[PDB]
């Protein structure tokens, strides 16, 4: 995808985060653990649902239309009726395939991007406290236990708490 | 020779999407569109100065 | 003590010129053509079976006037009437002409 | 382009690389040298021709259709099929300039993309070993030879080995 | 949108910035004070007339077409021109529908793109002399006058000069 993030930097996917489509695992000194991020989650299913909602909205009602199948031979008038309704069929058919394929491609790249900014979203959080591994992982070089990592999580993480102890074994 | 489109101009090659030489065809043929040139990019921007 | 390392992209003395959404022209590396602008000036044989009508019309061929009778139980893909066609027999009229000619040429 | 890489913080192409679309170009103690980028050209290459792909396929095939031009004013039948013809033409003459339109903007900014996704990607490799000098070049603090190069290339390079150098060099 | 910039990591517009698109604010030792950044408005300024002038070119010249409208009953002539009309009208009707939304999808992407490359070129000139502190925002860790925020504004910032200072105030 566009961002590099989804089969990116990001190596793979987690078939075992079964309650959202973005989140976290940790490893600190409680343990490991894994969690959803709903905000995220809740943005590219948002988007998701209001291009679904668009491309299924409002088939056309139509009544009396032109014969489309004939059981004799007429010539002109016939060939003039079949050209009018395989034209438009055609452009039809050309319009889906080009719907589908612009919306997935774009698809695609808006999961790959929400997956991006979060990994930025807490990578600003962080600020000097940890570094980007380059796998979509950080080191946090200080002790962070539960309740530290949930802080980062839920955006209310206090970077001037940790910093002297991370920049100590950051850089010393 | 050998071709699967036909147009009143002779034949006409058809790995092209679009053609510009008539709207009269037989067979396997571009579409017929106005334009007499469309260009699809295959590289990136060329920028070789500033 | 150290190095530099610089990320880049290639270039070109001159690319070609496309259009896209924001700009009427800029410039890329290479593109492709996806209009076909020119014909030999020749119809190729094949893969389709061409019957060359000649001096013949199809409705000529078919009613059997006397010059088009070379064409008795002929066959095509695509019959190719020419300009210099004519008749030499009955004169005559087919009231809605067009019709019986497409019905007869598919 | 949206990404800001090419025509961007990368001022201008190189038409010295002359063996890849995307690469590296470097200075160190054992003089200075060129390689292109072998994955991120072959990513632009593959999504390129693979859209090619896409657009080139299957011409529609047709056989009895209407006639279109006429050499007797007729009214009101060949009225009708040459409006059908030239609303037909003008609807895929509009898919046409469409089509092309948001393919090479997309192209532009794919290859924009690859650009900026192998910057990050080199970034990432160096950790607290470089500093990004904001040109699309990199400063690295550390004695670095081309076998050194050569691993930040091939993307092997072990940021731990040079890391106490570097800081030394950044930071004192 | 894609980028996370607008409606994103800067957490709104500023109804009180009227002379560009994009800017900056700042606060030092002299005050505080607003000024726009005239590259980066007239850069989204530029693409949004280009995608217009490409939109309002060239309404299609037509003279002698067929009737639309009837007066008398007639069967399968007519039942076959108001099937052309009608059919002519859904397919012009959905290329629009699908153009406005495929230009303003890019239009807000382009535009958020923009507003994260100002950042990003901002964050590239002040180097280690200063910390994203997460929602669009700089902390500059070296005194910075009036003549300063412009040498960053204006793109001439040497982060050489400061850099001591900086260092000292971040990490020690
Ligand atoms: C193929 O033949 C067509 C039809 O004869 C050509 O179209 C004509 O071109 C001339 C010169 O430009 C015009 O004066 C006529 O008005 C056109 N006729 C019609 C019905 O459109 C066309 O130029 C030929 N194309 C090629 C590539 O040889
Ligand atoms: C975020 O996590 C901390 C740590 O457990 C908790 O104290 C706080 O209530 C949480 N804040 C929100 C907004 O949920
Ligand atoms: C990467 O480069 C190093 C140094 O030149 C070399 O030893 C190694 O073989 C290379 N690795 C790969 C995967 O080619
Ligand atoms: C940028 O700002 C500095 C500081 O005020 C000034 O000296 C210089 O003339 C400006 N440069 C440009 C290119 O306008």
Redesign the interface.
């Given at each position: 995808g566009?961002?590099?993030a989804i089969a990116?930097?990001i190596e793979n996917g987690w078939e075992g985060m079964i309650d959202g489509w973005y989140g976290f695992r940790h490893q600190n000194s409680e343990g490991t653990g894994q969690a959803a991020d709903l905000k995220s989650t809740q943005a590219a299913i948002d988007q998701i649902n209001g291009k679904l909602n668009?491309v299924i909205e409002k088939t056309?009602e139509?009544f009396?239309?032109?014969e489309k199948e004939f059981s004799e031979?007429?010539?002109?008038?016939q060939?003039?009726?079949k050209?009018?309704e395989?034209?438009?069929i055609?452009?039809?058919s050309?319009?889906a395939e080009?719907?589908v394929?612009?919306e997935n491609?774009?698809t695609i790249?808006?999961t790959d991007?929400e997956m991006?900014?979060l990994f930025?979203?807490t990578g600003?959080?962080l600020?000097?406290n940890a570094?980007?591994?380059?796998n979509g992982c950080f080191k946090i070089y200080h002790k962070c236990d539960n309740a530290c990592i949930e802080s980062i999580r839920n955006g209310t993480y206090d970077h001037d708490v940790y910093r002297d102890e991370a920049?100590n074994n950051?850089?010393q | 020779c050998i071709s699967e489109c036909i147009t009143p101009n002779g034949s006409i090659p058809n790995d092209k999407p679009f053609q510009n030489v008539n709207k009269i065809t037989y067979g396997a043929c571009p579409k017929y569109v106005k334009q007499n040139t469309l260009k699809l990019a295959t590289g990136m921007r060329n920028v070789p100065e500033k | 003590p150290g190095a530099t390392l610089c990320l880049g992209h290639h270039a070109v003395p001159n690319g070609t010129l496309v259009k896209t959404i924001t700009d009427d022209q800029i410039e890329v590396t290479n593109a492709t053509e996806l209009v076909q602008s020119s014909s030999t000036g020749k119809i190729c044989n094949n893969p389709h079976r061409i019957l060359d009508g000649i001096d013949c019309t199809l409705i000529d061929a078919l009613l059997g006037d006397p010059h088009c009778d070379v064409f008795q139980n002929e066959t095509w893909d695509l019959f190719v009437e020419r300009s210099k066609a004519f008749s030499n027999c009955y004169p005559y009229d087919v009231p809605?002409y067009?019709?019986?000619r497409?019905?007869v040429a598919s």
């Open positions: 566009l961002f590099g990116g930097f668009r056309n139509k009396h239309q032109i031979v007429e010539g002109r008038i060939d003039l009726e050209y009018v395989d034209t438009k055609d452009l039809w050309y319009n080009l719907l394929a612009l491609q774009h790249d808006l991007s991006n900014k930025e979203k600003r959080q600020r000097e570094e980007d591994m380059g920049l950051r850089f | - | 809605d067009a019709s019986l497409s019905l």
